Write a protein that holds these residues in place. Structure first.
Motif, PDB file in Angstrom:
ATOM      1  N   UNK A   1       3.722   1.250  -5.758  1.00  0.00           N
ATOM      2  CA  UNK A   1       4.041   0.341  -4.667  1.00  0.00           C
ATOM      3  C   UNK A   1       4.478  -1.016  -5.223  1.00  0.00           C
TER       4      UNK A   1
ATOM      5  N   UNK B   1       2.659   3.115   3.180  1.00  0.00           N
ATOM      6  CA  UNK B   1       4.070   3.482   3.227  1.00  0.00           C
ATOM      7  C   UNK B   1       4.246   4.962   3.542  1.00  0.00           C
ATOM      8  N   UNK B   2       3.443   5.821   2.918  1.00  0.00           N
ATOM      9  CA  UNK B   2       3.583   7.262   3.078  1.00  0.00           C
ATOM     10  C   UNK B   2       2.894   7.791   4.331  1.00  0.00           C
ATOM     11  N   UNK B   3       2.182   6.936   5.068  1.00  0.00           N
ATOM     12  CA  UNK B   3       1.548   7.324   6.324  1.00  0.00           C
ATOM     13  C   UNK B   3       2.201   6.648   7.524  1.00  0.00           C
TER      14      UNK B   3
ATOM     15  N   UNK C   1       0.839  -1.190   0.000  1.00  0.00           N
ATOM     16  CA  UNK C   1       0.000   0.000   0.000  1.00  0.00           C
ATOM     17  C   UNK C   1       0.877   1.244   0.000  1.00  0.00           C
ATOM     18  N   UNK C   2       0.710   2.085  -1.022  1.00  0.00           N
ATOM     19  CA  UNK C   2       1.458   3.337  -1.079  1.00  0.00           C
ATOM     20  C   UNK C   2       0.999   4.279   0.027  1.00  0.00           C
ATOM     21  N   UNK C   3      -0.306   4.297   0.309  1.00  0.00           N
ATOM     22  CA  UNK C   3      -0.817   5.124   1.399  1.00  0.00           C
ATOM     23  C   UNK C   3      -0.218   4.668   2.723  1.00  0.00           C
TER      24      UNK C   3
ATOM     25  N   UNK D   1      -1.104  13.489   1.087  1.00  0.00           N
ATOM     26  CA  UNK D   1       0.010  12.709   1.610  1.00  0.00           C
ATOM     27  C   UNK D   1       1.304  13.505   1.510  1.00  0.00           C
ATOM     28  N   UNK D   2       2.118  13.435   2.561  1.00  0.00           N
ATOM     29  CA  UNK D   2       3.391  14.145   2.611  1.00  0.00           C
ATOM     30  C   UNK D   2       4.476  13.237   2.046  1.00  0.00           C
TER      31      UNK D   2
ATOM     32  N   UNK E   1       8.282   2.742  -2.522  1.00  0.00           N
ATOM     33  CA  UNK E   1       7.674   2.905  -3.846  1.00  0.00           C
ATOM     34  C   UNK E   1       8.675   3.412  -4.872  1.00  0.00           C
TER      35      UNK E   1
ATOM     36  N   UNK F   1       1.144  -1.196   6.118  1.00  0.00           N
ATOM     37  CA  UNK F   1       1.551  -1.274   4.724  1.00  0.00           C
ATOM     38  C   UNK F   1       0.828  -2.365   3.946  1.00  0.00           C
TER      39      UNK F   1
ATOM     40  N   UNK G   1       4.997  -7.442  -2.733  1.00  0.00           N
ATOM     41  CA  UNK G   1       5.661  -7.987  -1.557  1.00  0.00           C
ATOM     42  C   UNK G   1       6.444  -9.237  -1.940  1.00  0.00           C
TER      43      UNK G   1
ATOM     44  N   UNK H   1      -5.175   1.861  -4.527  1.00  0.00           N
ATOM     45  CA  UNK H   1      -4.381   2.474  -3.465  1.00  0.00           C
ATOM     46  C   UNK H   1      -2.924   2.026  -3.506  1.00  0.00           C
ATOM     47  N   UNK H   2      -2.414   1.713  -4.697  1.00  0.00           N
ATOM     48  CA  UNK H   2      -1.022   1.332  -4.860  1.00  0.00           C
ATOM     49  C   UNK H   2      -0.243   2.334  -5.709  1.00  0.00           C
ATOM     50  N   UNK H   3      -0.920   3.147  -6.516  1.00  0.00           N
ATOM     51  CA  UNK H   3      -0.277   4.135  -7.374  1.00  0.00           C
ATOM     52  C   UNK H   3      -0.691   5.525  -6.914  1.00  0.00           C
TER      53      UNK H   3
END
Ligand SMILES: Nc1ncnc2c1ncn2[C@@H]1O[C@H](COP(=O)(O)OP(=O)(O)OP(O)(O)=S)[C@@H](O)[C@H]1O
Ligand SMILES: Nc1ncnc2c1ncn2[C@@H]1O[C@H](COP(=O)(O)OP(=O)(O)OP(O)(O)=S)[C@@H](O)[C@H]1O
Ligand SMILES: [Mg+2]
Ligand SMILES: [Mg+2]
Lengths: 493, 257, 318, 255
Positions: free
Chosen positions: B253, A116-118, A112-114, B128-129, B236, A124, B256, B46-48
């Motif tokens: 992302x 990772x970035x959160x 999950x990119x969200x 998102x930061x 990522x 994750x 795994x 929610x991966x890109x």
DNA sequence: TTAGGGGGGGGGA
DNA sequence: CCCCCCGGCCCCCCCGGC
DNA sequence: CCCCCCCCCCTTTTTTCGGGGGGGCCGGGGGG
């Protein structure tokens, strides 16, 4: 800008915020939480070491229950509490085979990119929550089977929510998910929340009428809150002085299920003068239309298992049973008429009378046992399978016999029994040659032999007879058959 | 029609920018401030994560009183942007608490004005930061070559593995029908500097990605002539297409292990 | 002449909630909602021609005012309402940003929602929940049972009952005073009797009688609105002697042009609701009527078949 | 790696697949020293496809022992869709056929891409084709035949070919109407390829199915001239010529 | 009036 | 010459009284 | 604590024509 709480629906303004505010189904919530909390440990064990609860052999969970009981809220709250990212799909999105294979299929094993970035150690990963799965349409293109396969090959937790678990379309999900059931909340578990909402909304509700409101909505908390919101607009007091009218106005009209339909139809009370004046003939006919494909079958199945309470003077139970059977035969004729090329569906109401209402009125009473499900369907499937086998055998032996399939079953097969199975019982393993010769003379195969030996009925049942044959004899028979070149009757090209 | 006024001298630039990432995200929130226009969006899976920057140097004129937030459905915006010629000037106009934006297409030679109104959407999302990270892999390659390789490998498998080590880049795809491997090496030419494949490895890298998301990302090849891929170990992957004044970044992302 | 007079059903269609007759409690609740606001998801069910669509439109107007053009999305059976429309158009409307008065929300009207497919209804479930803070849904239907239970759980229920003869008389008298129609009491009584609680039918019959005969009396009214055939069938089935039933069949139904299929269907429907007769006798009558209907559907729609059906019905009661 | 067949331009091979990737799906490539030979039959058992390519067409065909490289045309098309049409294809097959090696090599960028495809077993029963003296033999540009077939396949599902003294007639009669095309033998010098040639022995009148002809005409991508041999009592043959081989379709006249 | 049988959960000697 | 777009057969599943 | 009582919820799946809806390839057209 922001939305003032005064402009929000009571079901959203008073929604649960934590898992301890969910009313009822505490065991189900705890089971789901335990299953989600140990998902990683089960993954390290390849989901093979079932634990104390036995939830370690499931990569996905399926939550089911009636509408408005707190399934989606519980799933979201449990997903959030353990610290996972949630990917939610519902009926408002396209979830066909191709879309599912191009969408969540990749998310099954992707970071999950969200997350990772959160950034917990589980933030994750994805907790895929597929809601309204029962709303999916299709058998192959719908993607229900694809979702079932995903459940088997999922690498992350996956939760399915549905309202009708016992449907043919949910057949693929039989034994691939941990089945969790949410039942209708009891009045006590929601009494405190209703009182809090009432004191917050500033209207007067008598605690004694709460049970009536909960019975009106059949346990639907959301419907109860909606009823409170609607009534409080003008009627500021909810008491015994107006409970009856409110209950009648807001009474849910839910179609009964086959078992309930059969139980109600075969009750003598509704066939009495007072019962008939209360539950009218129109109501009885409408009850049939709740499920017109299964009601006649249920009636035919359960019309012989009653103690009647409507017998006419001088009439025995057997006479009423005979009249009901005659009317059922007439209803079957009408059903044959309906589903013909003419498509005479306008006759559907008459069928309702001829198949369910009238026969029930003759044997209506108290159930003399348990309500059973119709056995005609399984018997019809068995008959179709046996007829297919008989057709294959007849066309395998067509070149040698002068008869039809019925004549083969009724005349030829008993004689073939004395030259294909009986010799093995007398000559032991020395009859393999003669039996194989006879089989070749009629272009019969080993599978044809097995199918033949399953047709005999009554005193000629063969299962025990064949089993008692020594295993060495059967092994030698198979070896000899597989070590020879046999003739072919039908050359498919 | 005073709060926000942004003029693209050519309307084709904005249309191309929108086309770059309209196949992955549907609802996008654009933040316009005195420094330019930024945008951040996340796809359904929610991966890109898609990030877009457009500075004040890409605008013939750009006047924004104080920051304004505009939610837009990229399908409607793309449909509107097809109604104007690629050579006309495109003015985006917005007001205070805007319920809709105005897109004015103006042509110089003809006395023609095409004013369209696009309704805005209410989108609830968090910005998102994205903090700078020292990727231990950086490869800059022509966009056409990356698109060709991605399209070729996506046919066989659903996932593509990128492997980076000393003076070699390997793209591998494995599927039921078969497998496909493509090996590129760093190369520089002074006569054709636009085809010079470059590599900078601090630590060997190996990352698997979904074919669908790479196919969506390569659609930005139109915007820029070269694509920069920055890879990490468990973070990522960044695919950047550089613009004249801004950029288009895709954070993908990885699968795994 | 190439000109059309506007029907009174449209010329006098109520424009405010205070002008709707019948269902006083429900209309009062609608007015209270229009006053305070915070309109909830609702499903309005009832029999045709009682003021459901009118009530929904009046509430939407009274709630939105000058914003009606942008804050209302109306869809009915004549418009495409497939799953794609729900997932694209309704979703876009719900997600649209529209500044409304403090306590107001956007409205999606789904008239005749009972004709929608199950897929669209299932798709609407999450759209209603996720955007309830800005949009609200009002369904109008005739058979509430055709709405899936998940949707009914998310909406309030407003069931409309038949309009009493007093309300119909009130509205008809108001229209008459606003149209200067010359009438007689028996004419209005006949109009109400033939209307059977349907305001639209009553108004249409009154307008037709006025335009065709001028004076609204029993004679002229019955020259426009024919005697309901279900009542004639009920009289035929309740007759004492077989000769009387056969006379009713021949003189009032067969010679007037009524088809045999219509006669048998009406006989079945009337028998199903003949509470005066015992249920078992009605079941036997229904069996005989079903046999006759099956014979008719096969092509033998003769008067002799109906006479035989009547004879069998009379024999059952003897 | 006994099998090593090189193609100067992979496009040729792709075109070969384009010829019969619609009528048949699974085929066996019986690669021998002389070259590659394949024979497929449609599901309806009415159309045959026979393909032969020789070492002369192949750049460096160097097969050593018989091999049956059975493959599915669907996946082969996908693998052939990768790589520029101007690159060389070095097809390489090993001792035991388990997977095939489609290697694409480009000299401008000195880069090589290696793709592999899994091989499947097929119960093929290759039947040798006998040679018969067909009644008539015509040859015309592939474009003209494709145009005629496409035009006459809209007014009917059956197309009648009538070969007679200095005349070839294509007729199609349906419910909307009728359509006839008459072509006479002619020869041109400034464009030799744009010529129609006919060898006529006995009058011929045979009706074919339009849907078979639609599949057949797809072979026009291979050759620019198509040759049809027709007989009264034998299946008609439609041949497209390659550099060193042929692609023939056998069809059964209907009635 | 409660079809029989199994699963849930609050109360309690 | 080749890629994207978007209208047009084909296909498959679900109702059917009032 | 086992025991008691009450309440809720599960048992389970076949088919003749015509129409309507929803998804998927296919192929014609435009465009770069
Ligand atoms: N157990 C519960 N406790 C408290 N409130 C509840 C509970 N169940 C439902 N509600 C209320 O009903 C609203 C909707 O609940 P949901 O969980 O979305 O309904 P549901 O159980 O998912 O049923 P469906 O299948 O969505 S109709 C919540 O926001 C609450 O206000
Ligand atoms: N309660 C009422 N008060 C006054 N006029 C009414 C009332 N109900 C119906 N009417 C008149 O009848 C017309 C049609 O009524 P509608 O409400 O539009 O029809 P309806 O009730 O929706 O029937 P269905 O179910 O949609 S077929 C209105 O335009 C009015 O003129
Ligand atoms: Mg839910
Ligand atoms: Mg209306």
């Amino acid at each position: 800008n922001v939305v003032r709480e005064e402009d929000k629906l009571w079901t959203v303004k008073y929604a649960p915020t934590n898992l301890q505010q969910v009313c009822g189904n505490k065991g189900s919530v705890m089971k789901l939480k335990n299953w989600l909390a140990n998902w990683e440990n089960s993954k390290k064990n390849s989901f093979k070491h079932a634990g104390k609860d036995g939830s370690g052999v499931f990569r996905a969970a399926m939550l089911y229950g009636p509408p408005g009981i707190g399934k989606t809220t519980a799933a979201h709250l449990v997903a959030q509490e353990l610290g996972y990212d949630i990917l939610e799909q519902n009926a408002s999105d396209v979830r066909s085979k191709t879309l599912l294979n191009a969408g969540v299929k990749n998310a099954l094993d992707n970071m999950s990119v969200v997350g990772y970035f959160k950034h917990n150690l589980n933030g994750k990963h994805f907790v895929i929550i597929m809601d309204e799965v029962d709303g999916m349409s299709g058998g192959d293109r719908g993607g229900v089977g694809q979702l079932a396969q995903f459940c088997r090959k999922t690498s992350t937790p996956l939760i399915l929510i549905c309202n009708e678990r016992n449907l043919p379309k949910m057949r693929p999900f039989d034994r691939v998910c941990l089945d969790i059931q949410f039942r209708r909340p009891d009045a006590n578990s929601i009494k405190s929340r209703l009182m809090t909402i009432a004191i917050r909304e500033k209207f007067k509700l008598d605690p004694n009428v709460i049970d009536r409101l909960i019975q009106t909505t059949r346990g639907d908390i959301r419907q109860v809150i909606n009823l409170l919101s609607t009534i409080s607009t003008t009627t500021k007091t909810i008491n015994h002085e107006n409970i009856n009218e409110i209950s009648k106005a807001w009474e849910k009209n839910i179609a009964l299920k086959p078992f309930d339909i059969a139980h109600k139809m075969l009750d003598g009370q509704i066939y009495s003068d007072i019962g008939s004046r209360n539950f009218t003939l129109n109501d009885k006919i409408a009850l049939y239309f709740d499920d017109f494909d299964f009601t006649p079958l249920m009636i035919q199945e359960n019309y012989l298992s009653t103690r009647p309470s409507v017998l006419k003077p001088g009439q025995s139970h057997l006479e009423a049973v005979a009249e009901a059977a005659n009317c059922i035969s007439l209803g079957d004729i009408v059903e044959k008429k309906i589903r013909s090329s003419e498509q005479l569906w306008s006759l559907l109401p008459l069928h309702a009378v001829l198949s369910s209402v009238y026969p029930a009125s003759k044997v209506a009473g108290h159930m003399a046992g348990r309500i059973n499900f119709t056995a005609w369907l399984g018997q019809n499937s068995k008959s179709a399978k046996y007829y297919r086998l008989l057709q294959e055998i007849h066309y395998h032996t067509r070149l040698g016999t002068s008869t039809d399939k019925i004549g083969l079953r009724l005349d030829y097969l008993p004689t073939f029994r004395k030259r294909l199975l009986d010799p093995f019982l007398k000559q032991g393993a020395d009859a393999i040659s003669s039996v194989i010769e006879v089989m070749d003379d009629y272009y019969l195969t080993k599978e044809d032999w097995d199918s033949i030996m399953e047709f005999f009925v009554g005193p000629d049942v063969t299962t025990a007879i064949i089993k008692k044959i020594p295993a060495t004899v059967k092994s030698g028979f198979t070896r000899k058959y597989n070590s020879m070149t046999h003739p072919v009757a039908i050359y498919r090209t | 029609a005073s709060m926000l006024e942004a003029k693209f001298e050519e309307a084709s630039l904005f249309k191309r920018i929108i086309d770059g990432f309209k196949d992955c995200v549907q609802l996008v929130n654009f933040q316009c401030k005195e420094d330019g226009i930024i945008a951040q969006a996340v796809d359904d899976s929610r991966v890109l994560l898609v990030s877009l920057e457009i500075g004040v140097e890409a605008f013939q004129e750009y006047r924004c009183d104080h920051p304004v937030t505009l939610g837009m459905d990229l399908t409607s915006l793309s449909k509107i942007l097809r109604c104007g010629n690629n050579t006309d000037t495109l003015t985006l106009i917005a007001d205070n608490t805007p319920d809709s934006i105005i897109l004015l297409f103006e042509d110089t030679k003809k006395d023609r004005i095409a004013e369209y109104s696009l309704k805005l959407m209410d989108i609830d999302a968090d910005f998102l930061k994205i903090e700078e990270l020292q990727y231990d892999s950086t490869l800059s390659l022509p966009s056409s070559e990356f698109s060709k390789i991605v399209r070729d490998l996506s046919q066989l498998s659903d996932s593509i593995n990128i492997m980076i080590t000393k003076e070699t880049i390997k793209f591998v795809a494995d599927g039921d029908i078969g497998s496909g491997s493509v090996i590129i090496k760093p190369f520089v030419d002074m006569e054709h500097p636009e085809t010079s494949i470059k590599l900078e490895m601090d630590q060997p890298v190996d990352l698997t990605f979904g074919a669908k998301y790479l196919l969506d990302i390569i659609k930005g090849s139109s915007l820029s002539d070269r694509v920069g891929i920055r890879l990490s170990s468990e973070a990522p992957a960044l695919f950047q297409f550089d613009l004249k004044s801004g950029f288009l970044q895709f954070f993908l992302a990885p699968k795994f292990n | 002449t190439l000109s059309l007079q506007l029907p009174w059903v449209e010329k006098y269609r109520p424009q405010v909630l205070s002008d709707i007759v019948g269902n006083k409690e429900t209309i009062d609740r609608l007015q209270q909602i229009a006053k305070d606001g915070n309109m909830p998801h609702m499903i309005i069910s009832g029999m045709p021609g009682i003021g459901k669509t009118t009530s929904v439109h009046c509430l939407a107007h009274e709630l939105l005012g000058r914003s009606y053009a942008d804050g209302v999305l109306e869809l009915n059976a004549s418009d495409d309402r497939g799953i794609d429309v729900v997932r694209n158009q309704i979703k876009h409307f719900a997600q649209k940003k529209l500044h409304l008065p403090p306590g107001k929300h956007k409205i999606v009207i789904l008239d005749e929602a009972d004709s929608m497919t199950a897929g669209a209804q299932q798709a609407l479930r999450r759209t209603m929940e996720l955007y309830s803070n800005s949009t609200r849904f009002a369904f109008a239907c005739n058979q509430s049972n055709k709405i899936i239970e998940p949707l009914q759980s998310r909406c309030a229920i407003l069931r409309y009952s038949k309009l009493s003869d007093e309300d119909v008389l009130k509205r008809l008298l108001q229209i008459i005073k606003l149209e200067d129609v010359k009438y007689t009491n028996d004419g209005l009584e006949a109009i109400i009797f033939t209307a059977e609680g349907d305001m639209r039918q009553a108004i249409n019959n009154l307008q037709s009688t006025v335009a065709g005969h001028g004076l609204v009396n029993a004679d002229n009214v019955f020259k426009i609105v024919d005697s309901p055939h279900p009542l004639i069938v009920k009289k035929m089935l309740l007759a004492s002697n077989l000769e009387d039933s056969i006379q009713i069949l021949r003189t009032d139904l067969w010679k007037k042009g009524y088809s045999s299929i219509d006669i048998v269907t009406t006989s079945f429907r009337v028998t199903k609701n003949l509470a005066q007769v015992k249920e078992s006798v009605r079941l036997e009558m229904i069996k005989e009527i079903g046999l006759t209907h099956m014979r008719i559907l096969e092509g033998v729609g003769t008067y002799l078949q109906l006479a035989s059906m009547l004879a069998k019905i009379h024999k059952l009661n003897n």
